[PDB]
């Protein structure tokens, strides 16, 4: 099961809009509870990563409004309504459906 | 608060291997199963397996089934990965973390160099 995302890196200013997408081979939806089994990470540069969104678009405690996972089945999104400073990061979307727990390559915000 | 330390980083020989400890603390030991992940120099993470303490379920990824062991010592809350026969492959962070998204505590890497 593959998880590829896009881009790989990109440069925004702080302030404006950014998606990034994450595809897989393989529907992440479990119709046992209805549920997308996809997660965001943000890693910072010597920092361990964190979790930022669970079942594709559920916040975890502490994390801005300003990111919002969406998407179902095979086709899923991460947006940041308006970059900050403190948002320069790689994302990564990881399978949390099956065995093994594959992440995507991630996307690498960079700022001007 | 939760903390997971783990093993200073290691500078190792090809064809030599290592053992990184994760020091668990702050949570019963034995609820979260212990998760570990390695961080590609450039950009990159692979899950390469993790170790349910109390039920002994241990699942690794077929792409480390050879490389990696996952141990654990119950009496002193400790998670052990043997990683053998590194290559410069192997040169990396690797990260131990609690469970898959319902806790989200994670080890402050260990760098591993092999030259
Ligand atoms: C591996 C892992 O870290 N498990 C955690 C994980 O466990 C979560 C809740 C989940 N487990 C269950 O649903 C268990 C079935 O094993 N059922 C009940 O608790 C009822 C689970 O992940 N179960 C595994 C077997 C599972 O569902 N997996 C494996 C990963 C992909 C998934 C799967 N679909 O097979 O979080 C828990 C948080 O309280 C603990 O921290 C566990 O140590």
């Known amino acids: 099961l593959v998880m590829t995302q896009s881009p790989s890196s990109l440069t925004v200013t702080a302030g404006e809009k950014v998606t990034m997408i994450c595809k897989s081979s393989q529907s992440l939806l479990n119709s046992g509870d209805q549920k997308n089994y996809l997660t965001w990470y943000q890693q910072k540069p010597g920092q361990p990563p964190k979790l930022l969104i669970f079942?594709?678009?559920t916040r975890e405690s502490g994390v801005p409004d300003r990111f919002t996972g969406s998407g179902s089945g095979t086709d899923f999104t991460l947006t940041i309504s308006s970059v900050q400073a403190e948002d320069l990061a790689v994302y990564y979307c990881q399978n949390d459906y099956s065995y093994p727990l594959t992440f995507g390559a991630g996307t690498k915000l960079e700022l001007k | 608060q939760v903390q997971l330390q783990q093993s200073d980083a290691e500078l190792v020989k090809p064809g030599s291997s290592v053992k990184i400890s994760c020091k668990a603390s702050?949570?019963?030991?034995?609820?979260?199963?212990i998760h570990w992940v390695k961080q590609k120099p450039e950009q990159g993470l692979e899950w390469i397996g993790h170790?349910?303490?109390?039920?002994?379920?241990?699942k690794y990824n077929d792409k480390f089934k050879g490389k990696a062991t996952l141990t654990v010592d119950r009496s002193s809350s400790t998670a052990y990965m043997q990683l053998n026969s590194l290559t410069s492959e192997d040169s990396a962070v690797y990260f131990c973390?609690?469970?898959?998204?319902?806790?989200?505590?994670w080890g402050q890497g260990t760098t591993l160099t092999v030259s």
């Open positions: 079942w594709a678009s």
């Open positions: 170790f349910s303490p109390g039920n002994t379920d241990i």
């Open positions: 973390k609690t469970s898959t998204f319902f806790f989200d505590y």
């Open positions: 702050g949570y019963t030991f034995t609820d979260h199963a």
